Amino acid sequence: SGMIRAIVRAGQARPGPPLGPILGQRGVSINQFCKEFNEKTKDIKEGIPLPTKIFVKPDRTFEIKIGQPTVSYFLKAAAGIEKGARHTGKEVAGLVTLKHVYEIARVKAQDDAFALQDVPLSSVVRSIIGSARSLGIRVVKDLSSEELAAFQKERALFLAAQREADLAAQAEAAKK
Amino acid sequence: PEVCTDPFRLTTHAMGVNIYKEGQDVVLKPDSEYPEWLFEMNVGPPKKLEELDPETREYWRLLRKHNIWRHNRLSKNRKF
Amino acid sequence: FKTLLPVPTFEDVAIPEKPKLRFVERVPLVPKVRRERKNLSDIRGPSTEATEFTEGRFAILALGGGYLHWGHFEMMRLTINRSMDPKNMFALWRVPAPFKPITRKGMGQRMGGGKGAIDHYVTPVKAGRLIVEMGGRCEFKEVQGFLDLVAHKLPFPAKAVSRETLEKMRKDQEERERNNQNPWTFERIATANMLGIRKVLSPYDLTHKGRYWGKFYTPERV
Amino acid sequence: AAALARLGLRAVKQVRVQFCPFEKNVESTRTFLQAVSSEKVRCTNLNCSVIADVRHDGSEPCVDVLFGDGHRLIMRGAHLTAQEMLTAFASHIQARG
Amino acid sequence: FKTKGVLKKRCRDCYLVKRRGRWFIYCKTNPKHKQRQM
Amino acid sequence: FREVVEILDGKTTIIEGRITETPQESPNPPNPTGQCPICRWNLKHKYNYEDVLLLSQFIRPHGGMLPRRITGLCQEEHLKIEECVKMAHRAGLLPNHRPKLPEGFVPKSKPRLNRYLTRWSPRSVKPIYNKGHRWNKVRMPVGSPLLKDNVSYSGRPLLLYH
Amino acid sequence: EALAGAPLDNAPKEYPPKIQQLVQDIASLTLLEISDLNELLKKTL
Amino acid sequence: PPPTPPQEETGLVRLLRREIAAVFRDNRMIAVCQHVALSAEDKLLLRHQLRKHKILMKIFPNQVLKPFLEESKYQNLLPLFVGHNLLLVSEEPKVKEMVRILKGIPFLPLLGGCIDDTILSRQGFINYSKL
RNA sequence: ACCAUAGUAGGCCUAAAAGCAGCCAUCAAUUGAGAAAGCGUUAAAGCUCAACAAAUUCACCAACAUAAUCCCAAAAACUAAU
Ligand SMILES: [Mg+2]
Ligand SMILES: [Mg+2]
Ligand SMILES: [Mg+2]
Ligand SMILES: [Mg+2]
Ligand SMILES: [Zn+2]
Ligand SMILES: [Zn+2]
């Protein structure tokens, strides 16, 4: 009938928007989809996002295909940061080692894209490096003993200063 | 809705590879278990046109990208 | 299948501070109290100043003579500023601000009574002079595209030229003048006073060589 | 391909193109096969069966279209151009069916 | 139809055809793009 | 030349492409090194609208012109020949190069007006009601400006506007 | 130098002369040579 | 016209010729198929099935491939390279598996190819699969 | 004509910003496709451009209404013209 992509949580598969109405319009029940998703991903840590593909057939039958989580989430978890940087390149949010990049590439090689495209891990590592560049995360060759925490402290103070500046700008705009 | 870690646990292992409920995080295997060519990739600025030699596919891929960029810039003004 | 050609890269050119065109005053800071005669020789003939590129790579070339006033200056400024990219382009004036006063009668419409009253100021422009000069990290196609509008809206005929285009047209004019087939030319006849044509000609025609007629310039007249 | 896609090929049963690639006058038939076996033509009707018969000694490239009007359109293309073949096929499809 | 001295295509579907001694911008998707050279 | 033939029998249609013999170029061109047909047969600036023996060499049987990539002409010669074919068709030359319509040939119309050297289409010209005075005279175009380079034995330039 | 013409099975009637000459070589030798040949092929393959 | 201004051969065409020569010299099985324009997911699935048997496919421009073909010893493959072309490149030729996996799609025709400097048609590949 | 898949909904802001209110980066998968040059959606979707694969005649700007008693010589594109 069509192709449906959805970013769904591991266990927080609610029958509400913005996913319930689409499947209801398609015709399949949403309770069955939520139950199937929960039983299939009951062994996955609840809270993480993951892309999935839903196939709807005439007579209102559905099937679920689930891929690996987003590289954004992978790299943010590796760097220990909650949110990415605003000004990419000019500011840096965290540091991810080439070793972490290789681990992420190995764990994500078993996805639909890189499975159908049988390519060496070098291509996946380069893709992860580009994703980190977009994320604003620098990729140092081999440097993590305590400078990671040293950079974490200054990143925290910079984030606090940025929050204060944003609050001041919002207050000035409101008073203007 | 997961959680990250502040201490040296980041420097001792990664927090993204572990997806299943069990905390079977992978250890940091040394160079004796990791490929040597992994640590020999350009992680800084991307390779430039004057840096790439004209006898590789990378040079022509970059040239094609630059040509597409030039066409987009010159066709920014869409008369029709 | 088509070949891959290299693209031009601009790194040596530097965008200066304030790349936008500067605001120009309608009247000079010190107004001209004395009313001056309207010399039309500041329009007649070819231009001797601001005929060559100084810092930019593109320009608006004037193929005729005329007067530029504050309306034209504001039009050029607004159009170029709104259609030009400040991050990769810069523009400069090549004509001074309006300084020549123009008088209108006003009180009383009958002939005589004295000179009129100063109404507005104009900048005289001759044929072959650059008006606005631009440069930066850009190609000629887009600059020509958004400068043709300014050239059309200018009073005198104008073109959006570049260094290469200006050199090409000058060389084409030189080639036409050197390979002209007929032995009879305006310059030769005027200088030799053949047929007594100096009676109907002008003392400035010896210099104009028949290519300039009043404020109009015909580039195809050799 | 676009012309066939914008025609509604829902009323076509089987299209079989039989040719010899080693000949010198099968280029038009091969281009016709490529145009008629495109993704848009596939998706505009799924029950249609497209067959590509390859021979070496046949020396006569031909196309056969059987459709549910009990109708058979056979075109032996040895000098016919691909564009003319496509136009004739489209005209016949929009005429009958 | 608008009678103009300069004809320009306002989209990709405008086609220029010479009829009755004049030039015409004809448009089927946007009929308001109909222009006639004066 | 190639022809397409259609056969219908029992709700079955078969179309066949038949190749028949076609005339070839004459063995001895006066200027064999020319890259262009007219310009190597030395007909440049030599034909007019009335040279139907040359104008009908490459036109479709229904009066349409043939593509340049097929004929082989240079661009200027192709344009000149196209204009000459148009002028001949309007003048009435080449009477067998029209489509056959038995249903439309029966309702005869007003007799055709004789004409020649007609530049514009007969249905696209408006009468000149004002015609101007001597200083601003509205002239009637005759012939085409593409043929202004033809050889003139008398030496007088052709009057393309009268 | 060039390759073959790729004959098909619609009119397959000509075979390469290599197999025929190999058959002739096989037939033009004695039983001792046959024994040595088959034992050598057994030992190798 | 004046004599020919011989256009210099650029790095792109040089590298394409080098890759074509490497393909024609290294591997043994070189099949030729007609490239039918279908969905990219179907293309990816086809490459997936082909790489199950570790035999690849390549696409090269005709403007570069035809002069190389007529200059090399493969001048008998000229009729196979007019339209959209696919070069199935294989070491240790296994035509049986290729036929088995290409039989699923009915309208991809095997134009022909060569196995160890032996040109074979679709009937030849059928024979090799039967072997 | 010719098809346009990928990490990925790049990162922030935002109810939503998926190439396209906006700011910063502009890497990378494929033989070949810009974190996207125009339409379109609230946001998606979808329609095109450039990209590869196929052939490739030629292709940069240039055209612009009218007045009053009644239009205003008639007509003519080739017999030799400093
Ligand atoms: Mg003007
Ligand atoms: Mg690539
Ligand atoms: Mg395209
Ligand atoms: Mg009016
Ligand atoms: Zn339009
Ligand atoms: Zn010619």
JSON list of C-alpha atoms (C1' of nucleotides) in Angstrom, two decimals, chain I:
[
{"chain": "I", "resi": 1, "resn": "A", "atom": "C1'", "xyz": [14.38, 12.74, -23.84]},
{"chain": "I", "resi": 2, "resn": "C", "atom": "C1'", "xyz": [17.14, 10.34, -19.23]},
{"chain": "I", "resi": 3, "resn": "C", "atom": "C1'", "xyz": [16.62, 8.59, -14.17]},
{"chain": "I", "resi": 4, "resn": "A", "atom": "C1'", "xyz": [17.35, 10.35, -9.73]},
{"chain": "I", "resi": 5, "resn": "U", "atom": "C1'", "xyz": [18.85, 5.87, -4.11]},
{"chain": "I", "resi": 6, "resn": "A", "atom": "C1'", "xyz": [22.31, 6.86, 0.87]},
{"chain": "I", "resi": 7, "resn": "G", "atom": "C1'", "xyz": [24.60, 7.93, 6.86]},
{"chain": "I", "resi": 8, "resn": "U", "atom": "C1'", "xyz": [20.32, 11.59, 7.58]},
{"chain": "I", "resi": 9, "resn": "A", "atom": "C1'", "xyz": [14.82, 14.20, 9.93]},
{"chain": "I", "resi": 10, "resn": "G", "atom": "C1'", "xyz": [23.32, 17.08, 9.51]},
{"chain": "I", "resi": 11, "resn": "G", "atom": "C1'", "xyz": [23.52, 20.22, 14.19]},
{"chain": "I", "resi": 12, "resn": "C", "atom": "C1'", "xyz": [20.51, 24.39, 16.94]},
{"chain": "I", "resi": 13, "resn": "C", "atom": "C1'", "xyz": [15.78, 27.47, 17.39]},
{"chain": "I", "resi": 14, "resn": "U", "atom": "C1'", "xyz": [10.77, 26.13, 16.82]},
{"chain": "I", "resi": 15, "resn": "A", "atom": "C1'", "xyz": [4.04, 23.38, 17.91]},
{"chain": "I", "resi": 16, "resn": "A", "atom": "C1'", "xyz": [6.38, 21.37, 13.68]},
{"chain": "I", "resi": 17, "resn": "A", "atom": "C1'", "xyz": [11.63, 23.25, 10.36]},
{"chain": "I", "resi": 18, "resn": "A", "atom": "C1'", "xyz": [12.58, 16.03, 6.97]},
{"chain": "I", "resi": 19, "resn": "G", "atom": "C1'", "xyz": [17.31, 19.91, 0.93]},
{"chain": "I", "resi": 20, "resn": "C", "atom": "C1'", "xyz": [14.49, 24.07, 1.40]},
{"chain": "I", "resi": 21, "resn": "A", "atom": "C1'", "xyz": [11.10, 31.23, 8.57]},
{"chain": "I", "resi": 22, "resn": "G", "atom": "C1'", "xyz": [15.98, 31.24, 10.00]},
{"chain": "I", "resi": 23, "resn": "C", "atom": "C1'", "xyz": [21.93, 30.55, 12.07]},
{"chain": "I", "resi": 24, "resn": "C", "atom": "C1'", "xyz": [26.50, 27.19, 11.64]},
{"chain": "I", "resi": 25, "resn": "A", "atom": "C1'", "xyz": [28.93, 23.49, 9.19]},
{"chain": "I", "resi": 26, "resn": "U", "atom": "C1'", "xyz": [28.64, 21.77, 3.74]},
{"chain": "I", "resi": 27, "resn": "C", "atom": "C1'", "xyz": [31.55, 15.92, 5.35]},
{"chain": "I", "resi": 28, "resn": "A", "atom": "C1'", "xyz": [30.49, 11.01, 3.67]},
{"chain": "I", "resi": 29, "resn": "A", "atom": "C1'", "xyz": [28.09, 5.72, 0.72]},
{"chain": "I", "resi": 30, "resn": "U", "atom": "C1'", "xyz": [28.00, 4.06, -3.86]},
{"chain": "I", "resi": 31, "resn": "U", "atom": "C1'", "xyz": [30.91, 3.64, -11.20]},
{"chain": "I", "resi": 32, "resn": "G", "atom": "C1'", "xyz": [27.70, 8.33, -10.76]},
{"chain": "I", "resi": 33, "resn": "A", "atom": "C1'", "xyz": [23.62, 12.43, -6.93]},
{"chain": "I", "resi": 34, "resn": "G", "atom": "C1'", "xyz": [24.47, 19.97, -3.94]},
{"chain": "I", "resi": 35, "resn": "A", "atom": "C1'", "xyz": [23.40, 18.35, 3.97]},
{"chain": "I", "resi": 36, "resn": "A", "atom": "C1'", "xyz": [20.36, 20.96, -2.07]},
{"chain": "I", "resi": 37, "resn": "A", "atom": "C1'", "xyz": [19.64, 25.54, -7.39]},
{"chain": "I", "resi": 38, "resn": "G", "atom": "C1'", "xyz": [13.73, 26.25, -8.19]},
{"chain": "I", "resi": 39, "resn": "C", "atom": "C1'", "xyz": [7.87, 24.66, -7.28]},
{"chain": "I", "resi": 40, "resn": "G", "atom": "C1'", "xyz": [4.97, 22.24, -3.29]},
{"chain": "I", "resi": 41, "resn": "U", "atom": "C1'", "xyz": [3.36, 20.65, 2.40]},
{"chain": "I", "resi": 42, "resn": "U", "atom": "C1'", "xyz": [1.42, 23.60, 8.93]},
{"chain": "I", "resi": 43, "resn": "A", "atom": "C1'", "xyz": [5.16, 20.13, 9.10]},
{"chain": "I", "resi": 44, "resn": "A", "atom": "C1'", "xyz": [5.70, 15.38, 5.64]},
{"chain": "I", "resi": 45, "resn": "A", "atom": "C1'", "xyz": [4.76, 13.73, 0.90]},
{"chain": "I", "resi": 46, "resn": "G", "atom": "C1'", "xyz": [5.24, 14.82, -4.09]},
{"chain": "I", "resi": 47, "resn": "C", "atom": "C1'", "xyz": [7.17, 17.70, -9.06]},
{"chain": "I", "resi": 48, "resn": "U", "atom": "C1'", "xyz": [11.70, 19.32, -11.22]},
{"chain": "I", "resi": 49, "resn": "C", "atom": "C1'", "xyz": [17.28, 20.97, -11.81]},
{"chain": "I", "resi": 50, "resn": "A", "atom": "C1'", "xyz": [22.17, 19.94, -11.83]},
{"chain": "I", "resi": 51, "resn": "A", "atom": "C1'", "xyz": [25.16, 13.81, -11.28]},
{"chain": "I", "resi": 52, "resn": "C", "atom": "C1'", "xyz": [25.96, 9.02, -13.82]},
{"chain": "I", "resi": 53, "resn": "A", "atom": "C1'", "xyz": [24.46, 6.16, -17.38]},
{"chain": "I", "resi": 54, "resn": "A", "atom": "C1'", "xyz": [22.29, 7.70, -24.07]},
{"chain": "I", "resi": 55, "resn": "A", "atom": "C1'", "xyz": [22.88, 10.55, -27.79]},
{"chain": "I", "resi": 56, "resn": "U", "atom": "C1'", "xyz": [24.74, 14.64, -28.83]},
{"chain": "I", "resi": 57, "resn": "U", "atom": "C1'", "xyz": [22.18, 19.95, -36.60]},
{"chain": "I", "resi": 58, "resn": "C", "atom": "C1'", "xyz": [22.30, 25.29, -34.58]},
{"chain": "I", "resi": 59, "resn": "A", "atom": "C1'", "xyz": [21.24, 28.28, -30.13]},
{"chain": "I", "resi": 60, "resn": "C", "atom": "C1'", "xyz": [24.75, 35.49, -25.44]},
{"chain": "I", "resi": 61, "resn": "C", "atom": "C1'", "xyz": [21.67, 40.33, -25.79]},
{"chain": "I", "resi": 62, "resn": "A", "atom": "C1'", "xyz": [18.57, 41.93, -29.58]},
{"chain": "I", "resi": 63, "resn": "A", "atom": "C1'", "xyz": [11.06, 42.43, -31.38]},
{"chain": "I", "resi": 64, "resn": "C", "atom": "C1'", "xyz": [7.42, 48.66, -28.31]},
{"chain": "I", "resi": 65, "resn": "A", "atom": "C1'", "xyz": [-0.58, 51.89, -29.58]},
{"chain": "I", "resi": 66, "resn": "U", "atom": "C1'", "xyz": [-2.86, 55.88, -31.10]},
{"chain": "I", "resi": 67, "resn": "A", "atom": "C1'", "xyz": [-6.67, 62.00, -33.62]},
{"chain": "I", "resi": 68, "resn": "A", "atom": "C1'", "xyz": [-9.82, 64.20, -35.41]},
{"chain": "I", "resi": 69, "resn": "U", "atom": "C1'", "xyz": [-13.06, 66.60, -43.92]},
{"chain": "I", "resi": 70, "resn": "C", "atom": "C1'", "xyz": [-10.57, 61.78, -47.67]},
{"chain": "I", "resi": 71, "resn": "C", "atom": "C1'", "xyz": [-5.44, 56.81, -48.09]},
{"chain": "I", "resi": 72, "resn": "C", "atom": "C1'", "xyz": [-2.42, 59.37, -51.06]},
{"chain": "I", "resi": 73, "resn": "A", "atom": "C1'", "xyz": [1.51, 59.70, -57.92]},
{"chain": "I", "resi": 74, "resn": "A", "atom": "C1'", "xyz": [0.58, 54.82, -60.45]},
{"chain": "I", "resi": 75, "resn": "A", "atom": "C1'", "xyz": [3.80, 50.70, -60.29]},
{"chain": "I", "resi": 76, "resn": "A", "atom": "C1'", "xyz": [8.12, 47.60, -60.54]},
{"chain": "I", "resi": 77, "resn": "A", "atom": "C1'", "xyz": [12.70, 42.11, -56.43]},
{"chain": "I", "resi": 78, "resn": "C", "atom": "C1'", "xyz": [17.44, 40.77, -62.77]},
{"chain": "I", "resi": 79, "resn": "U", "atom": "C1'", "xyz": [18.59, 41.96, -70.83]},
{"chain": "I", "resi": 80, "resn": "A", "atom": "C1'", "xyz": [24.58, 43.99, -68.70]},
{"chain": "I", "resi": 81, "resn": "A", "atom": "C1'", "xyz": [24.96, 51.21, -65.44]},
{"chain": "I", "resi": 82, "resn": "U", "atom": "C1'", "xyz": [31.33, 55.12, -63.26]}
]
